C-alpha cells in the first residue's frame, strides 16, 4: 500500500535494472506527515550500535546501525585525509651515485610509512627547517654496493655477484635526537613493512642520505594517509517476493554470490533462501534471467553501514577510528570556541 | 578568523545568516548540515564551496520565525559533538568486548 | 688543486690539470665525466 | 645439466635448476623452452613423447 | 623503471610484494593465483603488479659500475 511504499522509500534503497532509486536521505521533520523525524538524542542512543565482525592486524570490519550517510562519509573522509601521521618530508643527499634519480628517490622515500606514533609528536611550525626534538625524526640510509669477494666463477645471478645491490627499507637506521632514545624503546621507531624495495644498485654506486620526517595530515599529501582503503557500504538485504523452488532456485545460487543464496531440500525439492546477505556484492546478474527478474527485490539498508578499514601498518585501525572521531570532536570544539569568542 | 558571520543584507536581519568557515571541506559541512537540518525551526540550510582552490565553505541558515539563526548553529554543533562522543564510547566498548571475547 | 674526473669505460679517478688532452690511463677512451659534488643538497618528498 | 635432469625424470623444476646451476632466470627459461613446455601443477614436461 | 611503493588508486603498499611476486613467477604459480596469494583482492593492485615492467636491471646493465 501507500504506507509500505513510504517505509520502503524512507528505510530502503532499491537498485533497479537501469538505475538506483530512493538514494536521498529524507528522514527530516516536515518531509513526512505521519512521521515525527525531529532530532531525538534518546532514540539515536537507543537505536545506534556497533558490531565488529572481523579485526586483525592492519584490517578492521565493523557494522554501524543507526548512523546516517552524512556522518558515515564524514568519518570516512576524516580517516582518509584528516588523520595525522609521520612521513618522510626532507631528504639530505650526500653523493648519490645511484641510477635512480634524486627526486624520484626522495619521492619513493616519502611514500614509505613510519611506525612512529603520531600522537607523541607535534606539527612543525612555519619554516624551522632545522627541526627540533619534539616535531621531527631522522633516518640515516647509507648503502655502499660492492662486489662479493667470494663467489662462483659464473655467478649469473646478481645476488651472488654483488652484495647490498637491492637497498631495502630495512637499511634505514633511526637516529635519536635529544631524549628520543629514552622515550622510545629500541625497535619502536622503524619502517613498517621492512621489505620495501627502494632502489637497486651496482658495484661502485653508493646511496647516502638523511631523512627528516614531520607530522602531517593526508589532506596536504597522500603520503600521510594512514589507511590504505577506508570505505563503507550499505548492508544488502535480498528479499524474495515469491517462493522460488526447483532447478531455477539453483540459478539463484549462480546469479548472486555463492555464499548468500542457499538451496535446501525441505520436502525433497530444492528451494532457495537468503543465508548471509552480507557476502553479496550486488553484481546485478539476476537481471539477465528474464523469468527471475520479477521474483527478487535487491535493496540496501539505509541506516546500516559496514565499514572496512585496511591500514598501512602505522597503527591499529581501531585507534585510527578513535583518532578520527577525536579529530571531528576537535573541529566541533574549535568552531564552538570561535562562535563563543564572537559572541 | 575561522568562522565569520554575514547578514543577508545591510539591514542586519538575523533570520538569514551566512557562516563562512575557513580551512574546511565537505566533511564538516555535510555533517553540520545533517545535524542542523533536523531542527524544526530551520526553513533553509545549505552549504556550498566557493572554489576548489581555496579551502573555505559557506553555510546559509534561514529560520522560520524570529530565531537569530546563530542559536541553531550552536545547537547543531553541540548535537554533533554529543553524537561523536556517543559513537566513540560505543566503538570503544565494542572493540573492548570483542578483544575480551576473542581471547 | 687536484681536479678529478671519471672515464667512460674504466671509471677510474683521473687527475688532470688545465689545457690537457682529454684521455685516460690504461685505455684510450675520450669521454670524461665530472664526479658528483660534495655539497649538501636538500630535496622535497613532494 | 638440464638434459641430464630430463633423462633422469620427465618433469623438471625450474627453481631447482636455477638453484643448482646458479644461473639467472632468463637463461634457464631459454634452456627449458628449447626442449620443454609448461604444464600447470606439474612443472616442465619434455615436448616430445617417449619414443 | 622501478616498481612504485604506493598504488596509484588506493595506496596499498605494493613495492614490498614485487620480488616475492617474481618468486611466484619463478615457481609454478600463474599470474592470477599468485596475485590472489599475495593478498591483492581489488583489481587495482593486480593491475599495478601485473602491468609493471622491470626496467631497472636493463638500465643497470648500462650503468657505469
Ligand atoms: Zn679509462
Ligand atoms: Zn591498489
DSSP sequence for A24-74:
S----BTTBSS------HHHHHHH-EEEEEEEETTEEEEEEES--HHHHHH
Ligand with minimal distance to E12 CA: 2
Q: How far apart are CA B18 and CA B3, in angstroms?
A: 10
Count Cβ atoms below 10 Å from residue A66 Cβ, excluding itself. Answer: 17
SS3 B11: coil
Q: How far apart are CA B18 and CA B23, in angstroms?
A: 16
Residue spans of the domains in chain E: they are 1-65
Which H or E element spans position A90?
Answer: strand A85-93
Quoted resolution (Å) = 2.9
Q: Are D4 and D16 in contact (CB under 8 A)?
A: no
Ligand with minimal distance to C30 CA: 1
Q: How far apart are CA A238 and CA A71, in angstroms?
A: 25
Which is nearest to A200 in space by CA: C19, E56, E65? E56
Q: Which chain D residues are Cβ-neighbours of A154 within 8 angstroms?
A: 22-23
Q: Do chains D and A touch (3 or more CB pairs under 8 A)?
A: yes
CB-based burial of residue A338 (10 Å sphere; 0-12 exposed, 13-18 middle, 19+ buried)? middle
Which is nearest to C2 in space by CA: C24, C13, C32? C13
User: CA-CA distances (angstroms) from residue A317 to A59, A61, A66, A308, E42?
Assistant: 7, 9, 21, 10, 19
Which is nearest to A343 in space by CA: B41, B68, B11, B76? B68
Q: A82-228: what CATH class?
A: mainly beta
Adjacent-strand bridge partners of A250: none
Q: What number of C-beta contacts closer than 8 Å exist between A and D?
A: 14
Chains with 3 or more CB pairs closer than 8 angstroms to B?
A
Determined by which method? cryo-EM
Count Cβ atoms below 10 Å from residue E42 Cβ, excluding itself. Answer: 14
Which DSSP symbol is given to A114?
Answer: B
Of E22, E28, E30, the CB nearest to D43: E28
Q: How far apart are CA B42 and CA B70, in angstroms?
A: 11
SS3 A284: coil
Which is nearest to A72 in space by CA: A314, A311, A321, A278? A321
Of D18, D25, D41, the CB nearest to E28: D41
SS3 A327: helix
The residue in chain B having the minimum alpha-carbon distance to the alpha carbon of residue A79 is: B27
How many whole angstroms from C30 Cα to the centroid of ligand 1?
A: 8
Mutate to test the interface with D, among E25, E26, E34, E57 (most CBs of D within 10 A): E26
Which is nearest to A305 in space by CA: A53, A6, A133? A53
From the DSSP assignment, how many helices (H) and strands (E) are in chain A? 8, 18
CATH number assigned to the domain comprising residue C28: 2.20.28.30
Q: Which chain A residues are Cβ-neighbours of D26 within 8 angstroms?
A: none
Which is nearest to B33 in space by CA: A74, A147, A154? A74
Q: Which chain B residues are Cβ-neighbours of A77 within 8 angstroms?
A: 25-27
Contact across the interface for C45 and A204, Cβ inside 8 Å? no
Q: How far apart are CA A146 and CA A158, in angstroms?
A: 11
Nearest CA to CA, how far is A105 from chain C (Å)?
9
Q: Are A203 and E65 in contact (CB under 8 A)?
A: yes
Q: What number of C-beta contacts closer than 8 Å exist between A and E?
A: 68
Superfamily for E1-65? Answer: Homeodomain-like (1.10.10.60)
Contact across the interface for A77 and B26, Cβ inside 8 Å? yes
Q: Which chain A residues are Cβ-neighbours of B92 within 8 angstroms?
A: 322
How many whole angstroms from E63 Cα to the centroid of ligand 1?
A: 15
From the DSSP assignment, how many helices (H) and strands (E) are in chain E? 4, 0
The residue in chain A having the minimum alpha-carbon distance to the alpha carbon of residue B1 is: A338
Ligand with minimal distance to C10 CA: 1
Q: How far from chain centre, in Å, is Cα E31?
A: 11
Contact across the interface for D15 and E30, Cβ inside 8 Å? no
Amino acid at each position: 500500500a501507500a504506507s509500505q511504499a513510504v517505509e520502503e522509500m524512507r528505510s530502503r534503497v532499491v537498485l533497479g535494472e537501469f538505475g538506483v532509486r530512493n538514494v536521498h536521505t529524507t528522514d527530516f521533520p516536515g518531509n513526512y506527515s505521519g512521521y515525527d523525524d525531529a532530532w531525538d538524542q534518546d532514540r539515536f542512543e537507543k537505536n545506534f550500535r556497533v558490531d565488529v565482525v572481523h579485526m586483525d592486524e592492519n584490517s578492521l570490519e565493523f557494522d554501524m546501525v543507526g548512523i546516517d550517510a552524512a556522518i558515515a562519509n564524514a568519518f570516512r573522509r576524516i580517516l582518509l585525509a584528516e588523520v595525522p601521521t609521520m612521513a618522510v618530508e626532507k631528504v639530505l643527499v650526500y653523493n648519490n651515485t645511484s641510477i635512480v634519480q634524486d627526486e624520484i628517490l626522495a619521492h619513493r622515500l616519502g611514500l614509505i610509512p613510519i611506525h612512529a606514533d603520531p600522537r607523541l609528536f607535534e606539527y612543525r611550525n612555519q619554516g624551522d627547517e632545522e627541526g627540533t626534538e619534539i616535531d621531527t625524526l631522522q633516518f640515516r640510509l647509507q648503502v655502499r654496493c660492492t662486489r662479493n669477494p667470494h663467489a662462483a666463477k659464473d655467478s649469473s645471478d646478481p645476488n651472488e655477484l654483488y652484495v647490498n645491490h637491492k637497498v631495502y627499507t630495512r637499511h634505514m637506521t633511526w637516529i635519536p635526537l635529544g631524549n628520543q632514545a629514552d622515550l622510545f624503546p629500541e625497535g619502536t621507531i622503524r619502517p613498517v613493512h621492512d621489505d620495501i624495495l627502494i632502489a637497486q644498485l651496482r658495484p661502485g654506486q653508493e646511496i647516502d642520505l638523511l631523512m627528516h620526517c614531520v607530522k602531517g595530515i593526508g589532506k596536504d599529501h597522500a603520503k600521510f594517509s594512514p589507511v590504505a582503503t577506508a570505505s563503507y557500504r550499505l548492508l544488502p538485504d535480498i528479499t524474495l517476493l515469491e517462493p522460488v523452488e526447483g532447478e531455477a532456485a539453483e540459478e539463484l545460487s549462480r546469479c548472486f554470490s555463492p555464499g548468500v543464496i542457499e538451496v535446501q531440500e525441505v520436502q525433497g525439492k530444492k528451494v532457495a533462501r537468503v543465508a548471509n546477505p552480507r557476502l553479496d556484492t550486488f553484481s546485478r546478474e539476476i537481471f539477465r534471467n528474464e523469468k527471475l527478474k520479477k521474483v527478487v527485490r535487491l535493496a540496501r539498508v539505509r541506516d546500516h553501514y559496514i565499514f572496512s578499514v585496511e591500514s598501512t601498518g602505522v597503527l591499529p585501525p581501531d585507534v585510527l577510528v578513535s583518532e578520527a572521531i577525536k579529530v571531528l570532536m576537535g573541529k566541533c570544539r574549535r568552531f564552538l570556541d570561535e562562535l563563543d569568542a564572537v559572541q | 578568523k575561522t568562522a565569520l558571520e554575514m547578514v543577508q543584507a545591510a539591514g542586519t536581519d538575523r533570520h538569514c545568516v551566512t557562516f563562512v568557515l575557513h580551512e574546511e571541506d565537505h566533511t564538516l559541512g555535510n555533517s553540520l548540515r545533517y545535524m542542523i537540518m533536523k531542527n524544526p525551526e530551520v526553513e533553509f540550510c545549505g552549504y556550498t564551496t566557493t572554489h576548489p582552490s581555496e579551502s573555505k565553505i559557506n553555510l546559509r541558515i534561514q529560520t522560520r520565525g524570529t530565531l537569530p539563526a546563530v542559536e541553531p548553529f550552536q545547537r547543531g554543533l553541540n548535537e554533533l559533538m554529543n553524537v561523536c562522543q556517543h559513537v566513540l564510547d560505543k566503538f570503544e566498548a565494542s572493540i573492548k568486548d570483542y578483544k575480551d571475547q576473542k581471547a | 688543486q687536484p681536479m678529478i674526473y671519471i672515464c667512460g669505460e674504466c671509471h677510474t679517478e683521473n687527475e688532470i690539470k688545465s689545457r690537457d688532452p682529454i684521455r685516460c690511463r690504461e685505455c684510450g677512451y675520450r669521454i670524461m665525466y665530472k664526479k658528483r659534488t660534495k655539497r649538501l643538497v636538500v630535496f622535497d618528498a613532494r | 645439466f638440464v638434459m641430464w635432469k630430463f633423462t633422469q625424470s620427465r618433469w623438471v623444476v625450474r627453481k631447482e635448476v636455477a638453484t643448482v646451476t646458479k644461473l639467472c632466470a632468463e637463461d634457464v627459461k631459454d634452456f627449458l623452452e628449447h626442449m620443454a613446455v609448461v604444464r600447470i601443477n606439474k612443472g616442465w614436461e619434455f615436448i616430445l613423447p617417449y619414443d | 623503471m622501478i616498481i612504485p611503493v604506493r598504488c596509484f588508486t588506493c595506496g596499498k603498499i605494493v613495492g614490498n610484494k614485487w620480488e616475492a611476486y617474481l618468486g611466484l613467477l619463478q615457481a609454478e604459480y600463474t599470474e592470477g593465483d599468485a596475485l590472489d596469494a599475495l593478498g591483492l583482492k581489488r583489481y587495482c593492485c593486480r593491475r599495478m603488479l601485473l602491468a609493471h615492467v622491470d626496467l631497472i636491471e636493463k638500465l643497470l646493465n648500462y650503468a657505469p659500475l
